[PDB]
Swiss-Prot record, chains A, B:
Disulfide bonds join 309-335. Its cofactor is Cu cation; L-topaquinone. Its EC number is 1.4.3.21. The keyword Mitochondrion does not apply. GO terms for molecular function: copper ion binding; primary methylamine oxidase activity; quinone binding. It comes from Arthrobacter globiformis. It holds the Pfam family AGAO-like_N2. The keyword Amino-acid biosynthesis does not apply. Topaquinone (TPQ) is generated by copper-dependent autoxidation of a specific tyrosyl residue. Binds 1 copper ion per subunit. It catalyses: a primary methyl amine + O2 + H2O = an aldehyde + H2O2 + NH4(+); 2-phenylethylamine + O2 + H2O = 2-phenylacetaldehyde + H2O2 + NH4(+). This is Phenylethylamine oxidase.
Length: 620, 620
């Protein structure tokens, strides 16, 4: 029915069959990425044509390929061989993770390094980390993963408590060869365990927490049709899921009176990078593009009722492809529910004698993913008043190192001899705008202070200014918290009853952006992270701020390249890319398991409605 | 038993007698302010000497007085006559909100102004607005109030929809005479009504909201003893209430293992000002110190269950004094409860096979107040992980004016001909720190970017720097969101197991501070609002950032004066004053009644604990 429905196991199996029939999926082939494509602009298509895009890896060393297929027509739309040294390697395969430890286990250099530390190889876990791009010429064109070691004293031990510093190895996961093993010197391996379920560390568990029961006698207020179409308190949207981006929101619209008014055509976290700020050669190459390199959606957790999602929850169980094209379901991977959100509006008027109070609520769509030591929760919220918000919740176990004897300017101490390198978690929200339709524009709004004098004799006046971003070349903006800078997306052709263009205002948290030196590899590979806001003209092939192939890919693609087209964005089909993140200087409180920290952004209506859109909310 | 218990009706009754049996209280006198004083520094003096501070007004015209009485021994500690022209007028009296309209009703200038606009005097409401200080020497030393008119078509009509622009009056509430009436010209009085309970405006109330049930079958996890002593999930504190400040938190401490560790000795919102940025002479003098001039606590609303506070709520009904010293109870003025706060910590570890998830919770202490057209919710939150947070929720009806023909750079249009002057809501949180005791210090922490080169060849390194604020002369700080600036309060004499001084980090929202010109009267009277953070040496008589008597005070009082003492704050008994606020450019969405908007701040432990303090939280 709806062209925005979630992919079904059948569609994935059909893609597999189409590829096989086309001779593109032999026994040496592996699916590194597979996702459904959004319908093309303009519903000119008589019927629906479900298309899937796939990245095909070859374990024998042959060139990989990018393929698009129409499962509807059972055809291969396009198939191109990729030159990875130029355009980038495919995303890391889940099957390649175990390869790093396995290969290193029999390498003489690795074994000698472990013996020098009196470590039993059988107990040494190796984290399969993306390699990035640096000065190792032999890595160009090859799929390389770098490994950092952690000791696990026993099956249920938390290896992160025992980092093996001064050692790092590089491995070619295709030819199965250890290219390099670097040992800069022995560091004491932190002895304290970090087992947060061990009574010896947790102590007696608290018995002081009484239960909080959240229930809905008449069920939830939202309805789900077509498997993923949501309707809740005037909001309308489709909940999609992609193995790379995770949860994607489609066709966010608000029912104002008798008309369905669009606001955002597509919303997603198009990239997220975790750059480390420790200059040690052991970790200075460390930059994890969880979204682009690992594909966060792929590792989404199955959420337990009453534990991960509390209350009356409706689940979606998205299906993705395994490495062979077989469908795999992520049971209860997406939670959907509405939750009370305190007071919405309130006023006790003396003159009228009327006391008015109304409560707020928000629709929540979320999922949680795990990538090695990190665990991230992605939350999208829709409020009664028209506000749209995204929130990222970062938790898990901090990535560790040894804590140098004389201290460090780039690492904090968590436990005796245990360090945690400084790093950032930076996201990029891609908002394909559709404020009352596709004809949109963006204005940067700053508060304007005024000087006391003629026309402002008492010096109390203050105003604001709005600057339209007309071409992509002038649409790379930075935050200015001091002047209350925000960005307004409006429709110059759609005006409210007061003759003003309708719009939505993006409120950023104004957290620090990418800290790395502008001449660094990461500053180029994650150029999007250096500025708070980017605006581009919509294009079918401009999906990620970092390009299609991020793994071991130098600069050359992504937002910087798109912006160069300097297209018209003043009253056109535009896309907003907002960078926002957390700068983490680990605290002792983050060890052995870190409490959630958050970051996000929100958009509030700005003259979108003709008056408050919640006057029809009952007292109840 | 506790010296921090809430004031009882009996204590207030005693205060009344003392004043009486001293000729201090009589038919010409009025209690402008009455509140209990906190215990003196040093509990070495067994037995608490419950003392109350009182501000006495005189309707006759005699000089007001500040009196400190001792309820414990029923005596008058001190009584001083005040020179208002010097130290400022007393807070506006509730009984004075009538006089402005009543007086103007029989004034020929006012009546002539209304007749010219064809307005029925019986339908004209007049807001009793603080006067401030502006080139009117005649007012100096006099108790003045300015009045702005709003038309109320009928008893249940919202007068805010019909502001009468181009007209303003100044009145003397003691001599009862209209000192002046300014009529700059006739402006059309907006005709549209703003009655948000009128079916024609609200339209059919939605019937789509299914109920959300929040219950605690076994009761709350917190205990209340001594009437206002709270104990919840290791937290310990005393919930106090003042007619000026509202809810005040005392002795915030955390039970870490076997010891109760103090964190904050006293937390309150010491001031809240609402400066307007409309240069029109009709409102250019507009600045409302809701806390300092009106006393937000006295107007606290009685919170309805299931409406204002949902779930298992434990109420506090603070008692205050009326204008004559009689005790008045504010039924259910304070809400206390705990609410679920999503995921606390989570990690699914591949190597250990252990999947771990824990839920977070927050203790909530709040109240809601109404000042004319505004309604503010004050919420304090205590989290399982040690985080302390404050949040202000602003709602009510926007203060209106006429919308000028030809537009305005300082007023927004909400409805046909209806304007909303730009303004700010700026709060000052007074945090009397006690990090593991009174020996504290504050450090400004900035993220530090590093240049690619020797020691940082890959240009990935980044660090942080901390600057200790040693003297008050260097303790007036500004925000710097770009460099992730925060402030850490630590105890140099109390170290964690890693030999690092324990501390708490204050995270600000970095919203714009006071926008008015530096030389404006408001910039001088609300100097605290021009900077984000102030640190002073504790002093029993330095309670408010604006001074004790804000109404019609020339300026420079409060923080600017305290800081001038340039006292030592490096490892001393100190107080942190954080300025934070909302800059409001009213939207159509804010009319006829505005949806809640928020602002606040939080403090998170920074090396305060030896490891996560929530490892003992059960899976539940
Ligand atoms: Cu982190
Ligand atoms: Cu406001």
């Amino acid at each position: 029915a709806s062209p925005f429905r979630l992919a079904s196991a059948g569609e994935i199996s059909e893609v597999q069959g189409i590829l096989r029939t086309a001779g593109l999926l032999g026994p040496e082939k592996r699916i590194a990425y597979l996702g459904v494509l959004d319908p093309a602009r303009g519903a000119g298509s008589e019927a629906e044509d479900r298309r899937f895009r796939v990245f095909i890896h070859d374990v024998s060393g042959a060139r990989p390929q990018e393929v698009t297929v129409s499962v509807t027509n059972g055809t291969v739309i396009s198939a191109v061989e990729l030159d990875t040294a130029a355009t980038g390697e495919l995303p890391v395969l889940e099957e390649e993770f175990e390869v790093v430890e396995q290969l290193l286990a029999t390498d003489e250099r690795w074994l000698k390094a472990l013996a020098a530390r009196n470590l039993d190889v059988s107990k040494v876990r190796v984290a399969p980390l993306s390699a990035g791009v640096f000065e190792y010429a032999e890595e160009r064109g090859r799929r390389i993963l770098r490994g950092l070691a952690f000791v696990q004293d026993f099956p249920e031990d938390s290896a992160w408590a025992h980092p093996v510093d001064g050692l790092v190895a590089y491995v070619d996961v295709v030819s199965k060869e250890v290219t390099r093993v670097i040992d800069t010197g022995v560091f004491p391996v932190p002895a304290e365990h970090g087992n947060y379920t061990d009574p010896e560390l947790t102590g007696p568990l608290r018995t002081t927490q009484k239960p909080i029961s959240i229930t809905q006698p008449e069920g939830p207020s939202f309805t789900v049709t077509g498997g993923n179409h949501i309707e809740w308190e005037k909001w309308s949207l489709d909940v999609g899921f992609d193995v790379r981006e995770g949860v994607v929101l489609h066709n966010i619209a608000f029912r104002d009176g008798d008309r369905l008014r669009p606001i955002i055509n597509r919303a997603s976290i198009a990239e997220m990078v975790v750059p480390y700020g420790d200059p040690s050669p052991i970790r200075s190459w460390q930059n994890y593009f969880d979204t682009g390199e690992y594909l966060v959606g792929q590792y989404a957790n199955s959420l337990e009722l009453g534990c991960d999602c509390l209350g009356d929850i409706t689940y979606l169980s998205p299906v993705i492809s395994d490495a062979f094209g077989n469908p795999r379901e992520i049971r209860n991977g997406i939670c959907m529910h509405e939750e009370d959100w305190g007071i919405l509006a309130k006023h006790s008027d003396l003159w009228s004698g009327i006391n008015y109070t109304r409560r707020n609520r928000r629709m929540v769509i979320s999922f949680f993913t795990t990538i090695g030591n990190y665990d991230y929760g992605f939350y999208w919220y829709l409020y009664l008043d028209g506000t749209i918000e995204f929130e990222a919740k970062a938790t898990g176990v901090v990535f560790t190192s040894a804590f140098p004897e004389g201290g460090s300017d780039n690492i904090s101490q968590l436990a005796p001899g245990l360090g945690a390198p400084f790093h950032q978690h930076i996201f990029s929200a891609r908002l394909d705008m559709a404020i009352d339709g596709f004809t949109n524009r963006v204005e940067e709004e700053d508060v304007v202070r005024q000087t006391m004098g003629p026309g402002n004799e008492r010096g109390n006046a203050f105003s604001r200014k709005r600057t339209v971003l007309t071409r992509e070349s002038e649409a790379v903006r930075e935050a200015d918290a001091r002047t209350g800078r925000t960005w307004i997306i409006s429709n110059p052709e759609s005006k409210n009853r007061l003759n003003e263009p309708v719009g939505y205002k993006l409120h950023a948290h104004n957290q620090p952006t990418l800290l790395a030196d502008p001449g660094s590899s990461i500053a180029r590979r994650a150029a999007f992270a250096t500025k708070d806001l980017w605006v581009t003209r919509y294009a079918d092939d401009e999906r990620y701020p970092t390009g299609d192939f991020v793994n071991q890919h130098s600069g050359g693609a992504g937002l910087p390249s798109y912006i160069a087209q300097d297209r018209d964005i003043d009253g056109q089909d535009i896309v907003v890319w907002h960078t926002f993140g957390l700068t983490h200087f680990p605290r002792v409180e983050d060890w052995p398991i870190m409490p959630v920290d958050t970051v996000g952004f929100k958009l509030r209506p700005e003259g979108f409605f003709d008056r408050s859109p919640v006057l029809d909310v009952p007292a109840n």
